[PDB]
């Protein structure tokens, strides 16, 4: 079973053959103070900003304040063992993380050390944590779909390959659920997934990993973890490590989806770091450069043209464009979007999905507010059929909500207004969807066709859900080839509409909800 017990010895012994006797030279400094994870270092004349500073043991610090006669650095780990007068060695290295294909299905901390207990990492080398985003001339327009599996999101608010779509809302409104369902849906789409957990408690991450493992999604996903207990440096650096890990795929011509969970907690950790460094607080006690943090973080998510990929790969990969899609999550306290961090993140991203408590309590789950939510890429990210169906739908629902506000006390409704009110109520009922139940493109297209072409009109509101379920089952058993054609091509034509109309008529005649 473990005959390797002999060979591990040879593996250990060959290290001595690998070791080097050369006497190196390094710059040296001494710790003068230790407090709350921040250390002040005297000396280190050659220290660079952002440099990795090596401490006693295998611990590291990041140099941030290069003041005269003193260096301020933050410890990336448990700082309590440090003491005044300890000797500190300045390396030449910037922060780097393990990166590669082998990270899939592994749980690693912000430093890249595997914490899942599945043994050491297989990886393809190391990449810098801090890196610049591709310039203007290296990008390509976003025109490819990433399917969320949610009717509301995929219809009204399309997300494209290379888009930055903010998920924003109050606590306990389903922000995490939507993102993990988006991760689950990618199990067979070929898009790699990265889930970055900032400041969440470890048991929640255990539950998330268990849910991803209950489906086939975990083998396609990388999980980066920075629990609430870990030092602020690790939490604030966590998104960048995930960004670099996703950028690994983006430059080779593969698609990656990266979920930043609670960037607000990253901003909180950075505020703590800045205040401990005695930097001047700005508005809401946040440091001034907090916008630069999120802006330079989020600008990495982009779609690059084939030329950039060929240049990066030195001709190994030709003709393929890489893309990184980011879905940041922001928590608002009472729907107040005027707060500093929400305003910055809303300014940066290419759109937002608003989840709010009132709709969630009303039973509208997912509680996507069609009015304030918007996608700035729009129809270019959708397949042709989905675009055709949903384009009218989203504004129709918004204006229905307005009309329902207006009409609430009027006894007499014009028949056009009655049509709008009934249609809006039925469409609002239609978009509700249970958790962990993604729908394929063909099924969403079929249901939206059933809604748009008026077939839902006579059905009473409560039976609409059973109508949808029965239609899905009937079409799946009787009309599989058309579903396969729609899922593969996503095309739309006169014969496609005719077949859909025939399917709707046959279902509505023969079947029972």
């Amino acid at each position: 079973m473990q005959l390797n017990s002999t060979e591990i010895s040879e593996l250990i012994k060959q290290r001595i053959a690998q070791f080097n006797v050369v006497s190196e030279a390094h710059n040296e400094g001494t710790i003068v103070s230790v407090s709350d994870g921040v250390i002040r270092i005297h000396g280190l004349a050659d220290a660079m900003q952002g440099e990795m500073i090596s401490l006693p043991g295998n611990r590291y610090a990041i140099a941030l304040n290069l003041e005269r006669d003193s260096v301020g650095a933050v410890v990336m780990g448990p700082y309590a063992d440090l003491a005044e007068g300890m000797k500190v060695k300045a390396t030449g290295r910037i922060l780097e993380v393990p990166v590669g294909r082998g990270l899939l299905g592994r749980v690693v901390n912000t430093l890249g050390a595997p914490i899942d207990g599945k043994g050491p990492l297989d990886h393809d080398g190391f990449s810098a944590v801090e890196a610049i985003a591709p310039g203007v001339i290296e990008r390509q327009s976003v025109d490819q779909p990433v399917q969320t599996g949610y009717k509301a999101v995929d219809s009204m608010i399309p997300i494209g390959r290379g888009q930055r779509e903010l998920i924003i809302g109050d606590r306990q409104t389903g922000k995490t659920a939507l993102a993990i369902d988006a991760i689950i849906n990618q199990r067979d789409s070929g898009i790699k997934a990265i889930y970055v957990a900032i400041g969440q408690k470890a048991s929640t991450i255990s539950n998330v990993v268990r849910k991803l493992e209950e489906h086939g999604a975990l083998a396609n996903t990388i999980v980066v973890v920075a629990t609430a207990s870990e030092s602020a440096a690790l939490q604030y650096l966590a998104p960048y490590a995930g960004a670099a890990m996703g950028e690994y795929f983006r430059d080779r011509g593969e698609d990656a989806l990266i979920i930043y969970d609670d960037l607000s907690k990253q901003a909180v950790a950075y505020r703590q770091i800045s205040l401990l460094l005695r930097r001047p607080p700005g508005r809401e006690a946040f440091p001034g450069d907090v916008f630069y943090l999120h802006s330079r973080l989020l600008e990495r998510a982009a779609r690059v043209n084939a030329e950039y990929v060929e240049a990066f790969t030195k001709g190994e990969v030709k003709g393929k464009t890489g893309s990184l899609t980011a879905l940041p999550i922001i928590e608002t306290q009472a729907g107040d979007v005027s707060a500093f961090v929400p305003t910055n993140v809303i300014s940066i991203t290419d759109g937002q999905i608003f989840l709010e408590t009132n709709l969630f309590n009303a039973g509208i789950r997912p509680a996507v507010n069609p009015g304030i939510s918007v996608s700035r890429v729009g129809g270019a990210a959708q397949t042709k059929i989905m675009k055709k169906l949903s384009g009218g739908i989203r504004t129709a629902l918004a204006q229905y909500r307005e009309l329902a506000a207006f009409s609430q006390f009027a006894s007499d409704l014009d028949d056009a207004t009655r049509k709008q009110l009934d249609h809006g109520q039925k469409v609002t009922e239609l978009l509700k969807q249970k958790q962990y139940a993604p729908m394929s493109v063909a099924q969403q297209s079929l249901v939206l066709f059933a809604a748009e072409r008026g077939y839902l009109a006579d059905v009473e509101l409560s039976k609409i859900g059973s109508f949808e379920a029965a239609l899905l089952a009937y079409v799946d058993r009787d009309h599989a080839p058309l579903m396969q054609e729609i899922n593969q091509t996503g095309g739309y034509n006169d014969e496609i509409e005719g077949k859909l109309k025939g399917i709707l008529d046959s279902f509505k005649a023969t079947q029972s909800w």
Partner: protein, 52 residues
């Protein structure tokens, strides 16, 4: 289940490597303690000063 078993086996192997390394270097320390030579020390000094 099979993947869990294989992962536990790999973890056990890495554990054994961690076990051996610490006591190995600790024994090498004593090898230095009981095999050091003043001529060897002078050789080390002269070697490093010859390449400083």
């Amino acid at each position: 289940a099979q993947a869990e078993i294989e992962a536990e086996r790999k973890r056990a192997r890495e554990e054994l490597r961690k076990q051996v390394a610490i006591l190995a270097v600790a024994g090498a320390e004593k090898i230095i303690e009981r095999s050091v030579d003043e001529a060897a020390n002078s050789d080390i000094v002269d070697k490093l000063v010859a390449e400083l």
